């Protein structure tokens, strides 16, 4: 449930991230795998070692999806319909895991963009990542 100021805060922050989204995507996953090692149970097929290219490849896919979602904040459920089926029907990812990732994405953003990461923007991104996670978890049962 995003407001006029939340959508503008997000876009503004996403604008500054620019071509580095994929990097932050990969860094976000590495942080999650480290801090919350139970998230690795969904990636048994991945080489999960530090700096691995499989994590870096996948991190671009997560970042692209999120770029997608920033362009379509007014209708996340249709924009994300395919990922939503993917996560609930095929992979069956437990909701709590999306809080782990969402947390590490904020940490990654705080690390790289301290001037942009104001108390207000912090709120808006939490809300944004939180909205995406509920759309991706909607069909879980």
């Amino acid at each position: 449930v995003l407001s006029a100021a939340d959508k503008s805060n997000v876009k503004a922050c996403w604008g500054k991230i620019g071509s580095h989204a994929g990097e932050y995507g990969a860094e976000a996953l590495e942080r999650t795998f480290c801090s919350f090692p139970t998230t690795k149970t969904y990636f048994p097929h991945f080489d999960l070692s530090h700096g691995s290219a499989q994590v870096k490849a996948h991190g671009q896919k997560v970042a692209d999806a999120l770029t997608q979602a920033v362009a379509h904040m007014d209708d996340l459920p249709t924009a994300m319909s395919a990922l939503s089926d993917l996560h609930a029907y095929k992979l069956r990812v437990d909701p709590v895991n999306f809080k782990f990732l969402s947390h590490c994405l904020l940490v990654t953003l705080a690390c790289h963009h301290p001037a942009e990461f104001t108390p207000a923007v912090h709120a808006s991104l939490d809300k944004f990542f939180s909205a995406v996670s509920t759309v991706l978890t909607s069909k879980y049962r």
Partner: protein
């Protein structure tokens, strides 16, 4: 329980932390990002907006006192349950704070450490900090009845 490696990462970073700065910063962001927590702090005055919260004198003093008990937690890290027993009762018996809210403050502190320390707040450094934060939250919830 932390290894000597983890303690060094934690103590190394904590040695550089501005207590007054990070404390009011962490607590103010908790009120901003999770606005339902403001309900527990109504005798602090203007919490009507993000800039009100962030320059609120009472917020700042309380963040400081919250951060000093983190520090005492760090010194007695092998006995956090000993360290937070009195604060646990208080949060439960007096303040009636659902301990699920302790997880939020801990995560906010980590974002605020990330903000300040940047590249030096590595994934390994972070993982150690997550253990501490989870352990302080477990310690605070322990005397709940």
């Amino acid at each position: 329980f932390l290894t000597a490696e983890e303690k060094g990462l934690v103590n190394g970073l904590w040695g550089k932390v501005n207590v007054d700065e990070v404390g009011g910063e962490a607590l103010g962001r908790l009120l901003v990002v999770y606005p339902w927590t403001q309900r527990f702090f109504e005798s602090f005055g203007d919490l009507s907006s993000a800039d009100a919260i962030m320059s609120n004198a009472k917020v700042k003093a309380h963040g400081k006192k919250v951060l000093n008990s983190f520090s005492d937690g760090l010194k007695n890290i092998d006995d956090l349950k000993g360290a937070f027993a009195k604060l646990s009762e208080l949060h439960c018996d007096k303040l009636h704070v659902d301990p699920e809210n302790f997880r939020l403050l801990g995560n906010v502190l980590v974002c605020v450490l990330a903000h300040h320390f940047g590249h030096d707040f590595n994934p390994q450094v972070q993982a150690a900090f997550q253990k501490v934060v989870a352990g302080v939250a477990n310690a605070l919830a322990h005397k709940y009845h």
